[PDB]
Sequence to fold (94 residues):
Amino acid sequence: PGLKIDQKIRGQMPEQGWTEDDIKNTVSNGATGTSFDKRSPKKTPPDYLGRNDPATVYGSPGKYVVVNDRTGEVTQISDKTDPGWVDDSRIQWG
Fold:
């Protein structure tokens, strides 16, 4: 409900195999890990000030969603169509 999807992420969803319902269903499956949202200013829309927050990971390796604990913003959706996808280094699987 407090989930925020910016325009940058909205643009990547259809190309990386995600739908808004897909993101909600994945989050509903429960937290599977943790990490940090260290996005650069250029990647934090209508704000552009960058992020420095802890985050929760949903899904599984290569098929995940990262949500900023403070903002509720989605920091990253992995590319489900890329089998060689490397997980972001900040992700800690539980």
